[PDB]
Amino acid sequence: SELNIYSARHYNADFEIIKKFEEKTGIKVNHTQAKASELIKRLSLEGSNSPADIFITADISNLTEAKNLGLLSPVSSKYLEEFIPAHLRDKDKEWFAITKRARIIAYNKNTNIDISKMKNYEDLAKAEFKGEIVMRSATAPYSKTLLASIIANDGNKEAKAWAKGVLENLATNPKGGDRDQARQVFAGEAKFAVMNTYYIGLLKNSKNPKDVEVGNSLGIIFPNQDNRGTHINISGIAMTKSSKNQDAAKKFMEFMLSPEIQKILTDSNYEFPIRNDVELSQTVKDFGTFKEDQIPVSKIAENIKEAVKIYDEVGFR
Numbered sequence: 001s002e003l004n005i006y007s008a009r010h011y012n013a014d015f016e017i018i019k020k021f022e023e024k025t026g027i028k029v030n031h032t033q034a035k036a037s038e039l040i041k042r043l044s045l046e047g048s049n050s051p052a053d054i055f056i057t058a059d060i061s062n063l064t065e066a067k068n069l070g071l072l073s074p075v076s077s078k079y080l081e082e083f084i085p086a087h088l089r090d091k092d093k094e095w096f097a098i099t100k101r102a103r104i105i106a107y108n109k110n111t112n113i114d115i116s117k118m119k120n121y122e123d124l125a126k127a128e129f130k131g132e133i134v135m136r137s138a139t140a141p142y143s144k145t146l147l148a149s150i151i152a153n154d155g156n157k158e159a160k161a162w163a164k165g166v167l168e169n170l171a172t173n174p175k176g177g178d179r180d181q182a183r184q185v186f187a188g189e190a191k192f193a194v195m196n197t198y199y200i201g202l203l204k205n206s207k208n209p210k211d212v213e214v215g216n217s218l219g220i221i222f223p224n225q226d227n228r229g230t231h232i233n234i235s236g237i238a239m240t241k242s243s244k245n246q247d248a249a250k251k252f253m254e255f256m257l258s259p260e261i262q263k264i265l266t267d268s269n270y271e272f273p274i275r276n277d278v279e280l281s282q283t284v285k286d287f288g289t290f291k292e293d294q295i296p297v298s299k300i301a302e303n304i305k306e307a308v309k310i311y312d313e314v315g316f317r
């Protein structure tokens with residue numbers, strides 16, 4: 001009858017998906033969108049009394065934070081286990097990926113720009129790029145999880161040095177999110193933006209012609225192709241321990257991995273599907289092929305607390 005979703009996703013495509021669920025099942029969805037940090041705090045304070053049934057994020061670490069705050073409940077679904085690879089879901093069955101996305105370095109391909117020395121995440125922190133980089137706030141999930149991945153791969157001293165150098169190199173204080181950083185590259189205010197791949201698709205296919213202009217100017221560097229490969233993060237989903245509509249919650253989680261919905265996620269939101277039998281949308285194919293970091297996303301997320309402290313220490317936020 002009702003299903004209460006707390007979502008840190010921030011996409012128009014989700015509205016269509018939810019309508020399709022309502023149409024299919026007759027269940028009314030109450031959709032609450034806010035920042036992940038706000039939702040996790042809210043879930044903690046509301047506790048067992050929360051009306052929430054579902055927590056959706058655009059980030060692995062937010063799911064693990066929620067798990068480790070005792071806020072989620074395990075789901076044993078043959079459907080989810082068949083179609084989500086084990087490396088993309090919790091061993092303890094409390095969180096499950098619905099998409100993949102890659103955090104890349106974007107440049108203005110309508111300029112002559114030498115990208116030969118901007119090859120790895122490490123390079124963003126190099127003195128030669130002072131004043132040439134833009135990135136959103138350190139408090140953003142994408143930023144926290146990227147730094148956590150650097151800790152996991154290269155250690156906490158490289159992480160701190162990276163964070164410090166990135167801060168020093170920013171063309172501007174962080175101003176809005178990925179699409180705003182992309183506009184700064186379009187406008188020539190910075191040479192390189194740290195951003196997720198799907199935003200390039202959203203922009204290029206936008207019904208707002210100004211978004212199309214921005215998206216059309218972007219080239220992609222997939223970082224670290226000569227070594228470990230590019231940072232992958234997930235959007236994902238969990239049932240809350242507070243859930244009183246558990247059947248609906250499980251139905252919704254399975255619906256997010258259904259063929260039609262995985263196709264919408266790539267066709268309409270330009271993300272990578274989790275299912276291995278869903279063709280990429282043509283825009284996403286145009287991003288190109290690339291090497292992905294093989295690290296389990298769960299292992300990245302083990303470093304989230306320290307990532308927060310490092311960004312705080314070097315002077316973000």
Ligand SMILES: [Fe+3]
Pocket residue numbers: 010058196
């Ligand atoms: Fe996003």
